[PDB]
Amino acid sequence: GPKHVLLVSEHWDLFFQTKELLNPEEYRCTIGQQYKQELSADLVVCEYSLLPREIRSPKSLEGSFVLVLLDFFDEETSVDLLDRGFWYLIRPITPRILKSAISLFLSQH
Amino acid sequence: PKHVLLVSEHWDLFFQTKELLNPEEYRCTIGQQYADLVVCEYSLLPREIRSPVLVLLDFFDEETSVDLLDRGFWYLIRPITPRILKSAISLFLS
Numbered sequence: 001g002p003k004h005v006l007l008v009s010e011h012w013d014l015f016f017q018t019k020e021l022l023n024p025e026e027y028r029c030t031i032g033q034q035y036k037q038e039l040s041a042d043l044v045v046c047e048y049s050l051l052p053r054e055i056r057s058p059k060s061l062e063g064s065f066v067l068v069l070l071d072f073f074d075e076e077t078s079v080d081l082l083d084r085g086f087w088y089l090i091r092p093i094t095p096r097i098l099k100s101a102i103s104l105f106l107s108q109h
Numbered sequence: 110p111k112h113v114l115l116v117s118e119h120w121d122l123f124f125q126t127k128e129l130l131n132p133e134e135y136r137c138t139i140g141q142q143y144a145d146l147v148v149c150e151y152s153l154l155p156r157e158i159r160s161p162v163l164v165l166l167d168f169f170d171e172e173t174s175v176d177l178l179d180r181g182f183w184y185l186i187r188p189i190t191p192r193i194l195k196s197a198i199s200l201f202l203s
Contacts, residue, residue: 092169100179
């Protein structure tokens with residue numbers, strides 16, 4: 001069965017282009033426009049702008065992992081994501097970067 | 110404590126980071142070349158090695174990034190402050 005990746009983003013073009021770079025037998029990608037998890041989600045990739053300020057990805061996690069996409073560098077923003085348990089990428093984020101980051105993340109986890 | 114090795118010439122970064130990590134939980138040391146966690150400058154990372162590591166980048170290059178991720182390496186791009194590094198370290202090790 002393929003790993004299921006939910007992208008929470010309004011960047012539809014990023015979604016489609018990243019999806020066609022991931023092998024469907026290994027990864028199934030779906031997109032939403034508001035932060036959530038799904039029962040089948042192995043990984044949620046969420047725009048910082050759609051990620052609620054108050055949520056955490058806790059140490060003894062039983063839900064999905066979440067990787068966060070940031071438009072910008074800001075020190076306390078970064079410190080804050082890291083202490084809340086989210087790793088992230090800062091833009092520029094190309095379909096190629098996102099594909100390899102998704103594969104890397106799910107292979108290490 | 111977890112052993113964290115920093116491979117970097119950024120001595121200010123080393124000391125200020127180490128100072129933020131509680132020495133009971135983390136033991137940080139420095140290395141001039143390439144541990145529970147290695148943080149390696151891109152400029153001192155081998156280049157044909159794959160990951161068994163967090164790589165510090167001076168700047169953004171799409172091809173470098175793609176390459177590191179496929180080789181198995183996560184990265185931070187500068188600016189990289191001691192508070193950022195201390196938190197990245199704690200995150201990776203938890």
